[PDB]
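Please complete every field before forwarding. Incomplete forms are returned to the sender.

SECTION A: IDENTIFIERS
Entry label: holo-602
Bound molecule: XNJ
Molecule representation: SMILES string

SECTION B: INPUTS
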Amino acid sequence: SGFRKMAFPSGKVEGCMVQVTCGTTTLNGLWLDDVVYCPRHVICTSEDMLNPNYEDLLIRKSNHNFLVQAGNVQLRVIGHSMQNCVLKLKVDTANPKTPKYKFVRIQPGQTFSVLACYNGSPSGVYQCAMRPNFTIKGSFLNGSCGSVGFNIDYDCVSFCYMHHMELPTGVHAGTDLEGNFYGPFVDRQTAQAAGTDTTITVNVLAWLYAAVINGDRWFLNRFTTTLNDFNLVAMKYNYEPLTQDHVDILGPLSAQTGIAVLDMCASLKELLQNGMNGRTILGSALLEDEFTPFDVVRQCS
Amino acid sequence: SGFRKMAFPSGKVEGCMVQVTCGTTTLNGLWLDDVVYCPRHVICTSEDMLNPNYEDLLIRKSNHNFLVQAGNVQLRVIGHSMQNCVLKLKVDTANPKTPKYKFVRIQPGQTFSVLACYNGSPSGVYQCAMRPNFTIKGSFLNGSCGSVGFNIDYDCVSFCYMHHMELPTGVHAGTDLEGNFYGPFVDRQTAQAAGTDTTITVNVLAWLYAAVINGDRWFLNRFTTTLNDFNLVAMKYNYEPLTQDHVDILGPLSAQTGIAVLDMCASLKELLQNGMNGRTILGSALLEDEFTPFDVVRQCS
Ligand SMILES: Cc1ccc(NC(=O)c2ccc(CN3CCNCC3)cc2)cc1Nc1nc(-c2cccnc2)cs1
Ligand SMILES: Cc1ccc(NC(=O)c2ccc(CN3CCNCC3)cc2)cc1Nc1nc(-c2cccnc2)cs1
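SECTION C: PREDICTED COMPLEX
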């Protein structure tokens, strides 16, 4: 019983975190086999952030300009190349702790664990969702760039996020591990801002099922709605549309609790229209949308 | 910016988790140097849980009755002893991954990370507080016994919790790593139940400071209260009394924000008496009490 914001165990990623320094800029890199991945803005100078040309900046670098430190051992850089917004630093030593891994781009609405790192040293681990507007509501301070987000399936780490920047509202933007940004963001100084966000409906329903599995039932009712009628209400409250695929994905949770998806949707409609009347669900006074159906199944009975 | 339920990186603990099997019962153990620690109820049988005498049950065991598996390697048990409610299984191999460690009993109101494990395999990591009533609101399923809670200071793991049981309300009870229970709980079948709980006032204030550091200011006001007058309000809302030591511990956060502790207390009084009027603080619609002042400083600017 119980339900927590639960991250994947971070050890397999800890053994990959290194420190990358160029000039006076230090940030984190990810060391897999004989390659270190890090944000390309490590090669930026103070008089470069407006309109930097990264191709020029990298042409002017040599391998010896990159100082890479794995704990107490300096790694010798023997090649450097750019891939989109990340840098690939080839080193003369393959990481003996390289896990089985994949580079996998996630969808908005999906969740992942973040290993926050500073100076190549892991500091904390937490669970994040990719928002519909392609930002993440992370917890990051200066120096955290290069920290990664990941999921773990059996023994295999699927890296999905590398941290690059903080937007003016305090949310975070980054790339996949091929260097391609999530969302309409760039690694330079502009007026860029997070666009409008929405609530991830399928996740809210998943979390209401978690609540029922954990004995929170007060929001249940005898009503069922239609998918069309539910989605009219979702639009009004800035919720994403619910699709039949979503209904299908909630099938296992529906069967375990005996509550049809469209029955649970009638509960969500009432919560949206009436509020909670001073009650809580799984310890929250708001409808939580950063747990996927998979997250609920993995964690709950 | 941002503020998350952040756990310590779990790798140093992952390398200590093993599986302990006695008869048909499997649970988790903690392998440090040449000793494996696990809950003594692994030696219970179905016809024992009412009034078990653990001293008799252990006298009737041999080393070969304990099957200990570290990943894919079976460890040979060469000694067994009881210490309070844990078992110490001496094995013929010292764990090469033993971190620097301490066994440290925590106070109610303090926080720690939990590495939830099944069959000796780590499954997830989350952050917990020890409640004033000596329970924890964990996330645990059958098979999770022996999972541990810990903090990490520099390179040193301070183990503070081993999981033993789930109470009827779905909260969790366990021991320190010397086998001594937190709270008035026993490792046998009784009508035992969590006592009444309270809200951890100093942590709520710490979290209001986190909110101010992160730009949430709407709950601030021009008023200051006295410590005595605040505590009259705390009692009415089932909050713990605020002491001068608490005020002192909040000193750094008070200085960073420029908000006197007794000034922030006037905000908390108003939130308790009036509610939030549909607003949120750090993404929550309720006053969060599972972040210590240390947690806020560690995570925030
Ligand atoms: C997207 C991006 C582009 C370029 C840069 N780099 C710079 O602007 C930069 C780089 C170098 C310098 C020169 N030196 C200044 C003194 N320190 C050493 C470097 C000055 C400025 C940083 C970023 N990203 C950043 N992320 C953060 C950040 C803060 C908090 C949480 N998450 C990310 C701050 S700057
Ligand atoms: C405190 C305590 C005392 C004794 C026991 N053990 C038993 O009651 C027990 C032990 C052995 C057996 C016999 N066999 C039954 C079939 N499986 C193999 C064992 C039957 C019952 C367990 C516990 N603790 C438990 N924790 C949980 C639990 C569930 C969910 C989350 N966290 C803890 C379930 S039982």
